[PDB]
Amino acid sequence: SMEQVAMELRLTELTRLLRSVLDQLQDKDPARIFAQPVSLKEVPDYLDHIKHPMDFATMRKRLEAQGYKNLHEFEEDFDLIIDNCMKYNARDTVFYRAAVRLRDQGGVVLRQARREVDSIG
């Protein structure tokens, strides 16, 4: 149908916007601490601690399959990156600290993304 097409154009444009959001958030991680899945070879117990692992490469795979229906879904995944780290790693670690800085800096990008998603529909 023409409606299904219109819908798919909206999803494609959301994907366009979320791809830009993703690039902006990932720039706030210049150390690349969150770029890839935590290695289960290198942290073999990880899944005993963290039930839903997340990372920026995993988000990008989902993004490129148009797997985020709305900004809320995307933000859920971003928040998992941060919250997983802040639980697994102690407060005094470079990892925890990287997550705090990512959360704080990402807030700004996400605040305007939400306005853009609502604004453009």
Swiss-Prot record:
Crosslinked positions (Glycyl lysine isopeptide (Lys-Gly) (interchain with G-Cter in SUMO2)): K41
Domain called Bromo: residue spans: 9-113
Subcellular localization: Nucleus; Chromosome
Tissues expressing this chain: Highly expressed in testis.
Function recorded in the entry: Scaffold subunit of various histone acetyltransferase (HAT) complexes, such as the MOZ/MORF and HBO1 complexes, that acts as a regulator of hematopoiesis. Plays a key role in HBO1 complex by directing KAT7/HBO1 specificity towards histone H3 'Lys-14' acetylation (H3K14ac), thereby promoting erythroid differentiation.
Subunit annotation: Component of some HBO1 complex composed of KAT7/HBO1, MEAF6, ING4 and BRD1/BRPF2. Component of the MOZ/MORF complex composed at least of ING5, KAT6A, KAT6B, MEAF6 and one of BRPF1, BRD1/BRPF2 and BRPF3. Interacts (via PHD-type zinc finger domain) with unmodified histone H3. Interacts (via PWWP domain) with dimethylated and trimethylated 'Lys-79' on histone H3.
Protein name listed in UniProt: Bromodomain-containing protein 1
Annotated organism of origin: Homo sapiens (Human)
Gene (name only): BRD1
Residue span relative to the full protein: 555 to 674 of 1058
